[PDB]
């Protein structure tokens, strides 16, 4: 079994470890710290027996909607990074991390939409998001450093 709670400064070391092991976008320590201090209410970790096994790091924005056809200014929640240690996958951790972050984006930060970028090859992640009713709304060409395309996936809150 796992539990969720908001991330704390003392979680950052384990979060970075997870990020280093599971993702190619290896942000520096100060990046994690600033997102925790600025958007901490929507920054969650998953815990198994006192260890962090997953996390979701958000960014809160104000700007043009990426869902609406017309230029329209909205509050947006942006998933910067989400990862779960391999041993603890297929347990619903990412699903519950996203739900918790979404609820805070909506209630704490008045977000009207949530969105993220995902590698077009990232089959597990895409399945996750489509199950949570994210839609592929844009294709960011050459979004990743190696040139790989991203789907911009989004949904209203
Ligand atoms: C994507 C990731 C975060 C999902 O974590 P997770 O805790 O295993 O996800 P969940 O258990 O909540 O998944 C829920 C649903 O998503 C889908 N899904 C998740 N992983 C899948 C896979 N490998 N293949 C097919 N569907 C998958 C399934 O529908 C799953 O439902 P189910 O378990 O009942 O079959 C995880 O695989 C991961 O950390 N990958 C490496 C880092 C990464 O790519 N992060 C996302 C970048 S945008």
Residue numbers in the entry: 11 to 167
What text does the study give?
Nα-acetyltransferase (Nat) performs this modification and transfers an acetyl group from acetyl-coenzyme A (acetyl-CoA) to an α-amino group from the first residue of the protein substrate. A BLAST search identified Ard1 from Crenarchaeal Sulfolobus solfataricus (SsArd1) as a homolog of the Ard1 subunit of yeast NatA and Naa10p subunit of human NatA. However, no Sulfolobus homolog of the auxiliary subunit of NatA was found, so SsArd1 alone may be responsible for the protein acetylation. SsArd1 has a mixed α/β-fold with 7 β-sheet surrounded by 4 α-helices and contains 4 conserved motifs, a feature unique to the GCN5-related N-acetyltransferase (GNAT) family.
The crystal structure of the SsArd1-CoA binary complex was determined at 2.13 Å resolution and the SsArd1–CoA/peptide ternary complex at 1.84 Å. CoA-bound and CoA/peptide-bound SsArd1 structures were almost identical and could be superimposed, with root mean square deviation (RMSD) 0.12 Å for all Cα atoms. In the crystal structure of the SsArd1–CoA/peptide complex, we identified a clear electron-dense Fo–Fc map corresponding to the first 2 residues of the 6-mer Alba peptide. The Alba peptide fragment is located in the pocket formed between the α1-α2 loop, β6-β7 loop, and β4 and β5. The first 2 residues of Alba bound to SsArd1 via a number of van der Waals interactions and hydrogen bonds. The main-chain of Glu127 and side-chain of Tyr154 interacted with the main-chain of the first residue Ser by a hydrogen bond. In addition, the main-chain carbonyl of the second Ser formed a hydrogen bond to the side-chain of Tyr37. Structural alignment of ternary complexes of SsArd1 and hNaa50p revealed that residues of substrate binding for hNaa50p, Val29, His112, Tyr138 and Tyr139 were located in almost the same orientation and overlapped with the residues Glu35, Glu127, Tyr153 and Tyr154 for SsArd1. A comparison of Val29 of hNaa50p and Glu35 of SsArd1 in these ternary complexes showed that the side-chain of Glu35 from SsArd1 is too close and features steric clashes against the side-chain of the first Met residue of the substrate for hNaa50p. Residue Glu35 of SsArd1 may play a critical role for substrate specificity in Nα-acetylation.
